[PDB]
């Protein structure tokens, strides 16, 4: 049939998730793009990002372990 | 494959400002393959970064290493869980001696729980579990290179997530019971996504199901790989245009609250989740419910709510692809209205369709919807 | 029945590459993990990698990772393995196994059914048809109480050769000997014990087959 | 990469007696409370087949006499009784993690009663001769133990250069060993001589078994 009855359980919360439950990532490899500054500076992108607040932004990926901080580089 | 690359203070400022300016909390993964002679972690490059961030008053949380179960494959170096735990302890000491002594630390960002991965995780948590604030692991359903359309729609594929989650908790409850568990990196298909699938309406079944299951099973935070990037599993494409999963995520945020409840069909291909409604939505009030549902049947299904909610006013939020490309569309409609940003600075409103009180809830073939039950006056939600 | 049938033996040249097949039958192809195992010629045995045909989950042996490319094919219940930059180290028998009920890594614990193996041979040395010679006394003697006759196969490349005695008849008296290499060519021989009574009034013809050169040869023992 | 080390590498065991093969590992082969060991059987020219999984579970078609025990790192296959078919290389393989490792391989001889070689000598084929090459074949069949020595003689003189030998694996039916000695000459080495002897020194005979033919034979 196409007829569907539902049963709900609404008596107590079963879990309590973070307000930031849904969060996102940026792949660490994007930092090797010459335009990294231009891309993340985009007002358009920031509007979309703001939409997902509150959230964590995780910067990570395979490249995490092949990235070296150089305080002399610009 | 990958060689070492340098990054600058400038890069760090770009990333931080993007996060700060977007109202996001940054988690930064440090490089765990910098090693001393004794195969301990060379904390020095991290120390330099920390001092820089401290000096700028940057509020940042930290991880150390990515998919350490893969270090052998990726870099011909093997770090056992024990040692990785010790390395985290060393990072914890450095954090507590810094300007931000109350910064959070998460790890170890292991892959999905195969036996090898589950032994690395267990040994890590025994060694270093006292200093992490949450346990992070990664999940993907498929291989991007090989994934099919039917895979993205198959409940037997969706269902394997369950045992992955159960297995992670089995390890954590044997080592650090009650430690919070987070998906630290997750999507449909690994290796940069599956083309024309991970970027489409069809990707949404996996994404919404994951969110539902995660919350229902005790996961606290889920981190979508990626927001923006080269992989096809991005929420936002190369032209900064949002994809169906972005819109699904936005709707989820608007409607779904933090208190997780349970819904179930009486009969696998019809999937159903229930939370308190987000009360921060001005349209809705304390006690309202948000149901969300996925129909993987090839025909429309009609849902009937149980007593005492049978005759409540319900707001429908039904997502369907804009044609002609069906489930492989990169465009989506909410209640028949195509979703598109108004301009570069402006998201559209997300418009409900109020249903008749006492009507059954229609869910077309291969679709998903949220339903807000108004005036539910559920005690658990207040 | 449950059954994996691999490709025919391949005599590919050095530095080149080759695609091995392994069709499965008797079960739902997509619900089982297919491993690949390598056997150096009588030197032991080693695992190469497994692959799930629904999901796409490949894990390789560190040793074989840059040499081997396991691919499934949902459409035709078939599996494949590609081998690149072939050296004499790669001259061996490759088996294709099975055994993982499910889609997840932890659901594979053991390999149930196996293939027949595919002999891969890497030398650019040329391919030569055998010469089959019948072995008896000048004319066989009914005096011989159990008449034991032979078949010598000399000067062939590459492996293998199929030896039988009376079109598949004469089972259980057959001693078919391991081919020993002669610098550039192979050579083997077989023999079969029979009663006094058959030789005189009944022919004995050993059936040789060399697929590589496409030769079938019947040789009467006189 | 748990190291799999297989304690006996070959063992001769007597038909009816119990055969006991060890397998050891680096690390440990036990997740939760299940020990992921696997035993196979490569028959001579045939693919291995699964005998026992998860250390103590007999696969299908497998006789009740094969028995796996052990756990942690110490595992033991046990056949009781030993039958003729059982002759093979037995492999212990760990499933405990990726990648899977495989033990060296323990081969089983059957200690049959001694048997004497059924030697035989065959002259070059009519056709082979015309081609310009001559080969004398000598088959020594159904002997045990495996050890044996063939001394080729040409008119009483021992030929040591030009011979090619080949032993079969242990027969699964009678548990014997067979061998094939072949001597190859050019024309003008073959026509030069009359008698060709194939001598075989085995443990069974006090003194060598001698089989011969003269080129003057029709
Ligand atoms: C639709 O799917 C069929 C399988 O039927 C499924 O099970 C029954 C109980 C119903 O609930 C149905 O909706 C399910 O999809 C396939 O065999 C069939 O070929 C499909 N038909 C179409 C229209 O594609
Ligand atoms: C870590 O790196 C620093 C700076 O590159 C180096 O001087 C130091 O010797 C390294 N640590 C050890 C103890 O090897
Ligand atoms: C882990 O690795 C360290 C060196 O990196 C070694 O000294 C130690 O014994 C290992 N511990 C275990 C038991 O895995
Ligand atoms: C900034 O850091 C402090 C402690 O280190 C914390 O109390 C505060 O809430 C942080 N800010 C955010 C946005 O989490």
Residue numbers in the entry:
A (entry chain B): 36 to 109
B (entry chain A): 159 to 425, 429 to 543
C (entry chain H): 20 to 241
D (entry chain L): 20 to 237
Article sentences:
Heparanase is a β-d-endoglucuronidase enzyme that specifically cleaves heparan sulfate (HS) chains of heparan sulfate proteoglycans (HSPGs), which are abundant components of the extracellular matrix (ECM) and cell surfaces. Structurally, the active form of heparanase is generated from a latent 65 kDa proenzyme, which undergoes proteolytic processing into a heterodimer composed of 8 kDa and 50 kDa subunits that together form the catalytically active enzyme. The enzyme employs a conserved ‘double displacement mechanism’, involving two key catalytic amino acids—a nucleophile (Glu343) and a general acid/base proton donor (Glu225). The heparin/HS binding domains (HBD-I, HBD-II) are situated close to the active-site micro-pocked fold.
